[PDB]
Each structure stands twice: as structure tokens, then as C-alpha cells.
Symmetry: D2
Subunit: 358 residues, 4 copies
Amino acid sequence: IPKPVAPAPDILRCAYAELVVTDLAKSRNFYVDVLGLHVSYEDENQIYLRSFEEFIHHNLVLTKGPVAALKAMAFRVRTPEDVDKAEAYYQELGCRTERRKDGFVKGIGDALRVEDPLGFPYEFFFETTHVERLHMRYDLYSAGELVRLDHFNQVTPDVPRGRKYLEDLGFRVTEDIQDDEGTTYAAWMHRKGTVQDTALTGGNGPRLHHVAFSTHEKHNIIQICDKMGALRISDRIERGPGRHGVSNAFYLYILDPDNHRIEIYTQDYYTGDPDNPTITWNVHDNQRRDWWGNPVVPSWYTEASKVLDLDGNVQEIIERTDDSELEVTIGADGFSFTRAGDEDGSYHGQASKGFKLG
Amino acid sequence: EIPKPVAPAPDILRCAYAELVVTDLAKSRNFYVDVLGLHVSYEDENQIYLRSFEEFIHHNLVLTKGPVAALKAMAFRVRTPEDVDKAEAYYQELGCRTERRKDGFVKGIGDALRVEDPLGFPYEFFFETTHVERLHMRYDLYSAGELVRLDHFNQVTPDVPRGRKYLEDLGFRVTEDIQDDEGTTYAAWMHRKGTVQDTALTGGNGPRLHHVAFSTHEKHNIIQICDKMGALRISDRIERGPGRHGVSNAFYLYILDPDNHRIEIYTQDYYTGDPDNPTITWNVHDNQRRDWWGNPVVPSWYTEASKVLDLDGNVQEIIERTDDSELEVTIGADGFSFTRAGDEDGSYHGQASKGFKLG
Amino acid sequence: EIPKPVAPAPDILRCAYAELVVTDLAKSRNFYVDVLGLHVSYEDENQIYLRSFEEFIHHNLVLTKGPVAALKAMAFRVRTPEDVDKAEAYYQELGCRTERRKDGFVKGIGDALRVEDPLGFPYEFFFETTHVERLHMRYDLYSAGELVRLDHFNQVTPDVPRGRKYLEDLGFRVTEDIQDDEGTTYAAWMHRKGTVQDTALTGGNGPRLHHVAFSTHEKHNIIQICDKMGALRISDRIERGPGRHGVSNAFYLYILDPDNHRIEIYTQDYYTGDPDNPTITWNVHDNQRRDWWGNPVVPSWYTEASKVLDLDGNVQEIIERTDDSELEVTIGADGFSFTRAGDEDGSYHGQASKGFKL
Amino acid sequence: EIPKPVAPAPDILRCAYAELVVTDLAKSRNFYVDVLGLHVSYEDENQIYLRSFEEFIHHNLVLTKGPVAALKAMAFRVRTPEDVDKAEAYYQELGCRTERRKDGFVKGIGDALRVEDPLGFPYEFFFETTHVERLHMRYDLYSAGELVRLDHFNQVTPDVPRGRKYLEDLGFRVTEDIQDDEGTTYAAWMHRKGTVQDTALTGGNGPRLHHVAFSTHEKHNIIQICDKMGALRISDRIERGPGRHGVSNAFYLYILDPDNHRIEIYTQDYYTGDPDNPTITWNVHDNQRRDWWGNPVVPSWYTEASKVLDLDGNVQEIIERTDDSELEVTIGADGFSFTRAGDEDGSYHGQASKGFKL
Ligand SMILES: O=S(=O)(O)c1ccc(O)c(O)c1
Ligand SMILES: O=S(=O)(O)c1ccc(O)c(O)c1
Ligand SMILES: [Ca+2]
Ligand SMILES: [Cl-]
Ligand SMILES: [Cl-]
Ligand SMILES: [Fe+2]
Ligand SMILES: [Fe+2]
Ligand SMILES: [Fe+2]
Ligand SMILES: [Fe+2]
């Protein structure tokens, strides 16, 4: 993917995702009643939701449709003129673009959507309707309150190809996972001064791995799990809670009614200095994904959401040919270590903590 | 059946300390003091005496050097000096071997009785103990992972109903248990001090010691223990968790000491002190009973536990459980678990939850 | 001196509930249910019965409509039905007015004894109570400020030693107290259940009820109550705190209900169940005794407390304390407190800590 | 008015470190290392260099032995080496005294410019710094009170609008301020990195340094600092808090070092990185603006602050504020504050909240 002559748009941060869902009422139950997100607008076709500290119109749009999928992952840009820059940048890349002066969803103004070089539906916008910032509305605060939108994670077959593209677009790599023979399994990259605004996971794609929201404290994440147990929907807790190695964040992954994966995340570190030290982890290091060594559940490696093109049809999936992280770590010929070079605390042909793949 | 003595039961206050035999005293000290932050009451070349942040009795844990790692004694404090005599009479009537030492078996304990109980466990009963500085407001010493109290023991024994009746006669009240619909009991929890447990029975081959549990103030303190173990690159010694228990409702973690003695870190169970405290029975197939979030129970939790000693210092012979295995009926190849009773969606057949099978 | 009966004391388990008379039942409901999140066991046009998250007995708090806000009863649960007989014999021997009702004074309590005790307080003793759903795992109902247990009462009485001896004869065990170097006792704490207190005596004009205290799980739950009260613009009803207590070592907050009944929120005191539990005496001039961080005690904490009723529903006459006043000797114009005993640096003369006077 | 230079502003990343002169280096070391747990990057008989848990630059705090306790420099990191030249030209155009050292003023910093800025404050601008081990996952070193980041400075200056305009020209964006209906500004907060502040202006006699602020992960970390100070019997060095701020919404604590330099501990403010981030203005009489729970602001917080040095190491002359005093108008004899605007209930006249006066 060549670097355009045209300047990249100045991207501020991840801003919202539009997810297609099959049953809007069941989705509302999950995101509003279980998770406590705040309704900015709703009707029979869509629900627009925001986090506790947000002032732009929404962080999540649920749109009723026939096939559950990512419709758009939206980044806010610094100025109105940056939408023009986005259009010219992606035009030069040869990508299909669509510009709407009055936006694609309610509460957004002039917006550009693109089918990007990795097959993902990106939106770029500046203009958005401001709403009441709920950051001191402690009369509304949930024991599991979701306070910010933090990041997206994308599944794509060739991580270096996507990384180079995102670097040209101005994202900076913070962390990655590699092996000794030069394969890259995952990379994390940011615009705002946190570990990530989007991230790439090696795998068959394009698929959307997850959308991540932040909490203030670790106990808020614990409460989400506790509430899911009380609602007898613990089967929708996919992975965690844990401490990540990469990012150092406390985390949880859960599954919405259409199997879209949502991460809850807190307490990663500042990355805003331009010489921020990068960190590379070895793929066999059993503390890289869960710092406590807990096993990564196989569905985390295999399952992700479909994404749509700009006509609303599902994007064709291209298979990864580089090595599989699942296979090399927890498969029958996989291994992981606790201490590099130590047989004690290593796992061969199975996961940590006494489990193999089901 | 273990008969109810005519002699009155000793008035037991609480679990008070465990004496563990360890093979390398310095390695064990690194774990309990440097990693876990327990406070040293006394040590020499043979023993380390340790206590939690809020304790005023001499110790909650004694580490004794010896050739075979094992539980040497699980000690309960009784209400009065006279209760030690009551304990002796009670266990004598049960036909158990007993040993009485007027000046104690370990430093910082006075008059004490040790017994080989009817389940083959080495119990101690004592009242007299040397008081030490209660560190409960020593926030200059407080660790991010601070262990604040000894909470309980957990014992592996083959016949849970048999053990449960004996402990009830001794004055423990059952707070929670796990049963199935076919009349099998897999585990029971029982108290004196008005929390969920002072000891507990886990069905399996025994006598073996499942774990000793310490409490923290808050859930973040348990998280910090995990985080510190990751930083020390000993995450392989985190056996299971952290999690929320179904039974007890406590936030928990299980870790393994250098001799594979299992330690639970525990917080925020509930008050049980009323005599009609409702007893909660969970079904063994309920996948929220042990981990409320449905995370799978690691197989070693069901299979591994510490040897225990008799009064001569020799390991007690193990008697095999003949009742159904909790591992086998839940996560084994013919096992079953559910998320919602009567719902096939979210049930597991012949494997564990979250996409795993037995290794 | 209150004599020790020949009759054996009833075996008291714990504090169990308070009945408070309130003047506007709907306003009190808004406070206890909507602000504080207590759970309704039963309500009608005259009464609201409330319980904490982990309770299995019918209630921990009864709000009763009446003309004069006051404590109507402070209730302790006893170990067996026969202990209610023991309580009746004990208080009859003390020469106190008693009243026995086989079917209870409030809903969800059976055979019960109410007494006008030697200090003028309306005590209830009961065993029988209707069990309800224990909500301890109902995380679907859990508030960010959740009140999990009833912990204790605190009583204002003019002669603390006289009250202390009576409560000891009744089986309460003193855990901590406050004295000076001239033989005056200002406060004492005493327990049945193995925590720092089930009731406590504060020196002052009485009988008056100082507070009822509820527990939370964690310190952040108390912080949330404060945050919520700010958001509701009722921060003027936060009286004192939040803080760390010296006595008890608990994290704490005091707030005021619509009738100015004081509620404490409390967490993480220590285990006192061993019979030789070490007692702790603090000097009244030690500025870490009430707030460990040295924050000043607001003067209303010393002067204001609720009326109590006799068994005919009339307010008990208030008897004035003649012993020295904790307020006067610490923060009044001729008061004194210290940070370090014998150190002039960090001491306060004729004023409160942190730069304030009254 | 301070005119805007034609020379381009240096691109400022963030606050980076402060150099404080202290009178007894060992006593200061015991406070910052033993009490507060900061990490040693370098020390000798004259200086101690300290950093927070998540820092990768050489230090966040330099303690320098000297005769008069004062701020020696408040340092901001700039984006590129060239921005140091830009800073030099900018301040030269402003007519300010500057000093350039190509090898730095303190260890672990390279090419650096120090200036006596137009408000009389010793600012440093640098890019080059020695990287050190980032301790962000060193949980074997983590304290119960761990300080994780340097967050901000707060400066006392007599004319807030004058300083505000100057800092805006320098690229800082205002997030929040405190004003009255007469048009007086009492304080402003302004940022470069995406948080509420990198520096802040407090109206008062100046130039003086009000505080340096460090972050924690969670609210319980701040509570622990208080608890530890109680156990060390130095609760007299807890000046204000802990509390919830109105401005910023952060949980906070102010403590005093051995030379009375004020240190704030701070957590959980909000994201401000979007260019149209909504600005919040509070009324000076709002009793929830500084402490959200309505707790009173101690008078020393308004009156006391640290001296600052000029580039010859002499104390800067103090200029007195002529605008209205926030102390006098809120908690002074002729002051007032409110809980609910327009409501005399929960208002305080000629005294502070919670029953206190000056
Ligand atoms: O599981 S990892 O530590 O690799 C990881 C780190 C940060 C993330 O946000 C994530 O989804 C996954
Ligand atoms: O006390 S204030 O809420 O005004 C405030 C807010 C943020 C700060 O950093 C501060 O020092 C003071
Ligand atoms: Ca069956
Ligand atoms: Cl379990
Ligand atoms: Cl107090
Ligand atoms: Fe993620
Ligand atoms: Fe346990
Ligand atoms: Fe209290
Ligand atoms: Fe500040």
C-alpha cells in the first residue's frame, strides 16, 4: 500500500462504531439495561448510545438489519478541512469513497466513508451534535459504568501490510507480538495518547474483533461480571476478567446478542510523547495477553464480526497464510512459557492452567 | 456414622493457625514473606511464625522444616482454658488419639491439645496464646496486597455427609453445600465465627488439606497479588482465579506455595452468625456455583491437595472416595454443566466452560 | 449505679433493626430508597420496611409516619425464643417498664419484648422474624453506593461509665473508648457480634439517638454516596466525612435524613470475637482518634441527635450531661488537641484542626 | 497585555518535571521516597532525581539542596529538538530573560532553555532526555499509595486573564474556570496533553507555585496516602481533602512536604483532546465547585504557596492581587456560598460550610 502524496487527515481519536444488529430490542436490553450506556436518540430502526464522559452525540449506533456486521468504524478528525483531506487521501489510494454533507447517521454532519485498503468501512468526520456531558451525573452512575470509548480491534491477514498503512495515516505503533523467525501476530497503534485507537489482530479478514469501552476502576469491570452472573448470562462472558500484558490494562470480553464482542478496559498508560518506547512481546510468552497466565479462550482467536462494504453487503474474507497465534501457543503443536527458556511453567500442546482446546 | 458424644463439645471461637511442614525454609519464607507480605512474629533455623495484618494472637501460620511437606496441625482457638479439657474429653469419647501439652506444641501457644480426628486430620485446640502488636492501623507497613486475617481451612475427605455430621456435633453450622439430585454431597462449608466458614469439606481422597485461606480488605488487593506474581514471573504459581465464588459470594484467588500447599486469598463473604442462617444448596451441574462468572474450574483444584500428618509425624494413609467425582460429573468426558437450569443454550457436555477440555 | 440482676442476661446476637418515626413518609422514602438504594420488604401508607443487600431477616429499618421524628425502637436479635423470656425477666428485675407482644410490634417480627431501659432507651428483643429473599448475589440490583448490612447503633447518654457497666452486665464487650487524664470517659464502643460495635455510647445530653450505621463492601461505595449527593445538589446533607476513624479503624461518612436522623455509612473495621480482644483507649485530645487524618469534627456531630420515644409514644425527657464536653475540651474556645503527644507542633489551641474554628 | 509573538510557539507536549529547592535533603528524601514511594533515578549529596511508576523519561521531580526553599524550574517537554530554538526565539521576542544550555541544567536532560516568563515563573523547555526503565508493570515495586504519573502544575498569579491569554498564545487550551457575575476570574485550568490540565492559574499574590500534582490509578491509592500519614503521625501535613473536585471531577488530596511545598495527589479527570472540548465555568459562590461534597476549603490553601527563583537563584518579588479574593468572597466575614443557586437553605454567609469559620 503506497504512501499517498496527499496529506493524511489529522485523526483525533476513535469516536463511534455503527453495528448492524438483528433484533433491536434484544440489543437494547444488552447495551442499555445490562451495560448502562446512555441513550442519545432512538427509534424503531436505530439506537444511538454514549458513554458517561462523552460530549459528542454518540459512541455506538445500533442499526437494525438482516445480517449482523460492522457497518462503520468512525474516527473524528481535527478540522472540517480534514474530511476533505481524507477524501483526497483515499481517492489517491484508489479506494471507494462516499461523502455525505449531512452525515450517514443522526448527530454527525459532513462525513466521508471509505472501503479502506484492508476492506474496512472507515468513517471520518468533524461535525457532531454536542450533548450533555454526563461526567458528574453520579445520580445516573452504574456500579459498572462505561465512561469512554477507547478503541477498535480489527482482524486482518497480513499485519505488517496493515501496520504500514496505518502508520502512513498517522497512527503510531505502541506494542506488538512477534516470534523469533520474524512473523507478526498483532500490533497496537494510537492517535490519542493512550495505547491504542485501533489495533490489528492477525487472522482471516476483514473482520471486526471488538469495540472497547473504558471504566474508571477495576471494580467496575468486576461488577459487570457479577451482574452477568445475576442475570444468568455468564455464558456471554467470553474471556477474563484479567490483566493484559500488552497495554497493561485490566480487561473483560463479553458477547452481545449478535455475538459482537465488546471489551471493557481500564488503566493503560500514556503514549503521547513522540519517542514513546515501543514494546514487542514474544508470541510464546504466556504473560503477553493475560499477565496472570490465564489461558486465552479459543473463540477469541477464531470468532469475529463480519464487516460491510458501502452497499451494505458483507466483505469477502481473505485467509491468513502467516502462522496462527492459536496454533503456535495452545494447539497440539503449540507451546508457551512463563519464563523464557524454562521448562518449568511451560505448556506444550495445550493451554495453561491444565486445559486443552475443546 | 460418627456418634454424638455425651461429653459437651468445646466452645470453638474460630480457626486460628495452621502448621505446615515445608522442605526448604528459605524458599518458603520468600513466598510467604517477600511475595505475600505476611508479618514475622518469630523465626529461627527450623521455623517461621507469621501473622496477618489485623491479628493480635502470636501467629496465623507456622512453617516448620521437615522431610515431607504436609499439614502438621490445623488449630482452632477455644473460648476458655476449660474448653481445652472439654476438647480432650470429647475426642477421647470419640475414640481418637490425643496429645496434651501444657506449654504448647509451637512457640506462642500455651496449653494445647492435638488430636487425630475421626476423619484423620490433625486438629489442635488451644486458648492460651502470646499476644503481639496488632498491626491493624500500621499503614506504614500496609502492602498493596495485604493479607488482613486468617479466614478458613478446607479439607479433602471421601465421605462428606459423614464428616459434616461430626462437625455439626462439634458445633459448626453448615452455611452452604453442593449436592446433586441423586443424593450425593460433593462439598460443604461450616462456621463458628459468623462468616461463611472456618473449615470446609471437599469430596475426594483423604485426609488431605485442600487449602488455607487468608482475607484481604478489598478486591483490588487480590488483583495486586496476581499482578505482583506476574511481575515476579511466577504466574505459573497462580492455580485458579481470580474470580467470584457462587458458594460464599467471595472474591477469590488460589495460589501454590513452593511445596504445592494451596493458599486461597478471599474477601467479602456474608454474615452467618444467626442460628437460623439460611443454608444454601447448589446443584453440582450449576456452572455458576464455584465461579459465578462461569469460568472453568482447573482440574488440579479437584485432584491435588496436601498430605497430612498423624501425631507421630508420619503421613496419614489416603482413603479413596467412592462417591461420585465432582470433576467427572461436571467437566469430565461424561460430564455436564448448565448456565440456566433446563436450558440447552449455555450448557456444556463432556467438557469445561469457555471452550476448554481437560488437559 | 445500675445493679447486676440475678436473672441471666438474654443471649444477644447482634443489632437487627431500628424503627424511626418520620414526618413525611414520601420524602423519607426518596432518601432511603432513591438516594441510598435500600430494598423495600413491605410498604403501605403508614410504614416502609427496608433491608440491606445481604439481609435475610425481614427488615433492618422501619420508617413509621408520626407527628414527631424520633427513635421508636432499637432492636436486637436474640439467640433463641427462650431468650425473649430471659430479657423480660432481666428487665423486670431491673425495675424497667416492659411490654411483650407474641405477634410483634411491627410486620415481619414475631414474639417481641420492648423495654424502657435504664438509660431511657426503647430497646426491643426478638427471635422470630419472617425470612425474605437474601439479595446478596442480586448484582442486577446492586447500586454503586450499595448498603450491604446493618452494622450498629450509637446512643447519646450523659454518664458513660454508668451506661457502660449496664451494657457489660447485659453481655456487650467494650472494644474501644475515649478518656482523658482526669478520669472522664467521653465515649465507649461495645459488641456482641464479632465486630467493633453493635451499640456505642457517646457522652451528651440524653437519651438521644446519635446514629444508625450501615456497611458497604468497599471504600469507593462510600465515596459514591458523596458523589451522588453532590449530583443531586444535596451536599448540605453530608454532615461529616468521608474519613478514616481512629476508633474502629473504619472508613466512614455521616449524612442526614429529611428529619435530621443521622445515618453513618461504614466499612472495614476488625474482628473482635475473641474474649480477650485487646481493648483500646484513646485520649480525648488526640486529634487522630475520631478522624485518623486529623480532619476536624464538625460541631453538629457533638450537639445534634434524635429524640427517642417511651413505650406510650411520647418523647423521653432529656437529662443534661455534667461531665466535661468533648466539643468544649477539643475544639471550643478553651479546647486543645494534638497530633503527636507532647509536641506543640501540630497542636491546636482554642480551635479546630486544619485552620478552622467554630 | 502580553502581545502574541510573531515567532511560532514551541509545540509543548506536557508538563514533565519540577525542580524544587529544599533545605534538608535527607528530610525531603524521607518524604518523597519513604512516605510517597517515588522512584530514584539518580542521587548524590546535593540532588535527588525521582520519577513516577509509569514514566520513561529520566525524572519527574528533582530535589536540589539550597538555602531557601523555592521552585527552581517548572519544565515542559516539547515535541522536537527544534522546538527548543522556537522557545528561545518566542521568549526573546517577549523580552524575557533566557538561558540556553546545550547539555542541560539537571542530569538526564539534554539541550534545554530556561526563562523568566512574563508572569515571573522559571519555565524550562526541553526535548532530549535520558530514557530509563519504565516501571509500569513492576508490580513487585508497587506501593499501596503508588504515584503513577506527573499530572500538572498550579501557579499563583495576581491577574488571571492576563496569564490566561499568554498561555493560550503558547498553545494551552482552557478547560475550566471560576468566575463571578461581576466578571472577575478567580482561577483557570489549561492543557496540552489530553487531560484537564498541564498547568493552572490560581488568583493570588505571585509569582508563587501553588502545587505540583501526581496521579494515582484509583481512589483507594489516595486514601492509603492519608492512612499512612496517620500511622506516621504526620496527619498535620494533610492540608486539604481527600475529596472530589468540582472543577476537573478528579478525586484529590493536598499534602505538605518538609519545606511546605504543596503536593496534590489526583485521579480520574476526563478527556479534553478534541479541539471543541466544552469549556466549563463555575460561579465562585458555588460551594460544590472546589469540593463537590461541599467540604470547606481550608484558608491556608488560598493564602500559602511556594516562592519561585529567578535565573540567578534569587527569590522573585511578589506582586499583590488587586482583583477580589476567592477566600474573602466565599468564606470571609463578608463572603458567602450556596449549595443550590438561589436557595438560602444550604447557603453559608460570613463563614465556611459544615459548621466552621476561619
Ligand atoms: O490480550 S492482549 O494483552 O494481547 C490485548 C491487549 C490490549 C487489548 O485492548 C486487547 O484487546 C488485547
Ligand atoms: O479545588 S478545585 O476543584 O478548584 C481544583 C481542581 C483541580 C485541581 O487540580 C486543583 O488543584 C483544584
Ligand atoms: Ca442427576
Ligand atoms: Cl470454588
Ligand atoms: Cl468519630
Ligand atoms: Fe482491545
Ligand atoms: Fe476456600
Ligand atoms: Fe458509628
Ligand atoms: Fe491541582
